[PDB]
Design a binder for this molecule. Structure first.
Ligand SMILES: NCCCC[C@@H](N)C(=O)O
Lengths: 437, 429
């Protein structure tokens, strides 16, 4: 019952990556897994047109940007730095939209090159309008619809928890500022033209929740008759572990596309749709590849067997940050599929950082508790593969903690060959900006 | 009224760091606060000697290292990379202790230079013994005493921890026979299970840790590790080094009387040395509102989890103060406002004012009324912030670090990273 491969790495393909990266740890990305997600998103049900934007904050490697560009997938940038980064990878400016918490001081330069801006607060709209007064520049507007992920918590707001929308969220402009005239007054003051509305409150895999997401956001498109595009954001869930449900884009897409048809039947306007998936595009396409460098034991009550890797929260932080479980497969350090065998052992996986919280197998949703996974019996030198690590891992980790170098990145082509796309960082590069004093 | 200053920055001094750094965000370190912490640690009560090691994993800046080195403070490194990094800052090899989860493949090269190694596993002790078999080597042993912080959760000791060698492998001959099979000389013992502020607990920590130096008569040093608690927020208790050290020093006296050996003591403060000595200096670049049930006023900083992760990672509260953006203390005023503070990352969890221990729940702080452009200073951020953050998330460059001397002058110790450097190691095709 031992897995003969991981989500996309056989024992032969894993050693091929390690050789290309000069050792462990490393990030492995599979072109095959990127093509499945790209095609699945480009097949999203739409009524009058679809645009897929990659939320590059999930994984900003230029090869990933170049690949999604070749598939006619656009880019959703989270800051002026991501805008300038995507343009370095060859993405044209017009294919980038900027939705940020911090409007960069050089936003006007980006807008001039063709970058579409989604104003995310009153302050950003006014700064945009001050610079392009009476012209009247087109701009996007992100709205906080007044509700977030969960509805009204099946009762009243309840506890004020973090959310992508609602009264406990700082994202977007509060919906009451749209309906009380505050935002339309700013638009008229600077002669702006609102061409696009942006929302981001979708979650789960319920088609009837996504239809309500669309209906509510579309109601803001009738406030500004010049709007021609509706950006519904991301949030499509990916089930990394067995039993968890991945969102079916065809099942939730058709009620969304019908909500677009109902708008065109009640308003007479056929709107372009946009989606901003981050996790759904790159999550299962990436995997952390590390080696078991040590194996220790405790005895007595609450004792465990610990597998210590040469990686950790420096490379995958989601276990420590959320208590997220990742699929884990242990392959023979020989690289031969004949040495997989059929021996299992329940273990706890820990990271190489000298920190108690550097745990790789936590209890679901509780990063302070231990949990054991039944894996292949591992000797020192065997490869551990953490799958589903292509989103918010390389692009969001505590790199250089304990002064560990930033892990390299490898691309595995459709033929099973490994290509290095980011060389390992050197030690001196970690403190190359320090100044003597 | 409102605070006319932060823990160590006035509006004028804060503007000085911003000038020296080119803008916000930035880390600021106080030479004064480092000096105050260095003296308290160097005054730890001891019976027969004390060595203070800075756990550089909390802030590895070379100026911080050079400073502690000038104060006779040694280094506790947690990886082969930190050992070399500390050596690049001018720290001798002999002033470095290596206690790491991951033994580097070039560890023999570090040991020959003078670096002292504490084996944290049977595997490590065996790899050390195989390379130095019968050559008169000396080594330390890090022992899991069998109890963590309780004198199933993640702990620094006990059956739940992977640090380090399980005590039952020492008391059943296994570790003794490894040392004897390779001709090793166990030089010191290493534990790290102390916590809190109770001197009775610290005395139980020292006694149980000293019971393992009985197994190896060659032991001359006893490293009790770190974990000295720092209360960043007003009302929280900071460990009194003087009152917990008197019962610990008595344990060394009781060991010398009954066992006949006067052991040297070592401590590894990390948080205690640098936490209060550093602050995150940022700018309020936006301010938004909501209405209705559980509505809030939000301050959007130009920093976030990319710079200070402890709020999101632990739900840890940090002391916060707001200064006028003009930099003139005459502009502090008397106006206040309860606000939620959020970072600049497009992330629902980039909260900077969470509930204590619940990083997903919002909890407002009463601060000075903030206009866009004002300065927010987050104190208690010199430990596990610049040395432990999600930098380059949303491609934000690594923030600069500034040192503030005794005369109030700001000195740049790390320039702001450029966008190009964030992906200077990427290869095409
Ligand atoms: N804010 C991040 C939340 C991650 C949720 C996780 N279950 C996923 O599917 O990606």
């Amino acid at each position: 019952t031992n897995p003969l491969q991981s989500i996309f790495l056989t024992p032969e393909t894993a050693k091929a990556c390690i050789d290309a990266a000069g050792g462990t740890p490393l990030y492995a990305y599979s072109i095959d897994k990127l093509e499945e997600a790209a095609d699945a998103c480009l097949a999203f049900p739409n009524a009058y047109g679809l645009t897929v934007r990659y939320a590059m904050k999930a994984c900003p490697n230029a090869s990933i940007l170049k690949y999604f560009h070749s598939k006619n997938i656009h880019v959703d940038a989270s800051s002026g730095f991501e805008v300038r980064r995507a343009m370095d990878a060859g993405v044209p400016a017009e294919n980038i939209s900027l939705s940020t918490q911090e409007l960069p001081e050089d936003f006007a330069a980006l807008v001039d090159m063709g970058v579409k801006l989604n104003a995310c607060s009153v302050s950003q709209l006014e700064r945009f309008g001050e610079h392009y007064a009476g012209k009247g520049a087109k701009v996007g507007v992100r709205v906080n619809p007044g509700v977030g992920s969960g509805g009204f918590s099946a009762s009243t707001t309840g506890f004020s928890k973090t959310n992508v929308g609602g009264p406990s969220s700082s994202f977007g402009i509060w919906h009451e500022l749209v309906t009380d005239g505050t935002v339309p007054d700013i638009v008229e003051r600077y002669g702006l033209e609102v061409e696009r509305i942006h929302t981001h409150i979708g979650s789960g895999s319920d088609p009837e929740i996504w239809q309500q997401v669309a209906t509510k956001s579309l109601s803001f498109c009738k406030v500004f008759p010049t709007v021609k595009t509706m950006n519904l954001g991301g949030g499509y869930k990916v089930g990394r572990n067995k039993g968890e449900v991945t969102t079916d884009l065809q099942k939730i897409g058709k009620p969304v596309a019908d909500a677009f048809k109902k708008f065109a039947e009640k308003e007479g306007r056929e709107l372009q749709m946009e989606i901003e998936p981050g996790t759904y595009l790159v999550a299962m396409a990436g995997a952390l590849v590390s080696k078991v460098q040590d194996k220790v034991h405790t005895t007595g009550e609450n004792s465990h067997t610990f597998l210590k890797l040469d990686a950790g929260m420096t490379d995958v932080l989601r276990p420590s940050l959320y208590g997220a479980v990742h699929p884990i497969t242990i392959l023979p350090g020989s690289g031969n599929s004949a040495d997989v065998g059929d021996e299992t052992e329940s273990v706890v996986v820990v990271g190489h950082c000298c920190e108690s919280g550097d745990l790789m197998t936590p209890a679901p949703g509780e990063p302070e508790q231990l949990a054991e996974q039944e894996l292949r019996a591992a000797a020192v030198g065997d490869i551990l593969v953490m799958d589903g690590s292509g989103a918010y891992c390389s692009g969001m980790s505590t790199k250089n903690y304990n002064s560990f170098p930033e892990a390299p990145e490898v691309l595995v082509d459709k033929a099973g060959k490994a290509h290095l796309i980011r060389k390992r960082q050197t030690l001196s590069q970690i403190y190359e900006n320090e100044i003597s004093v």
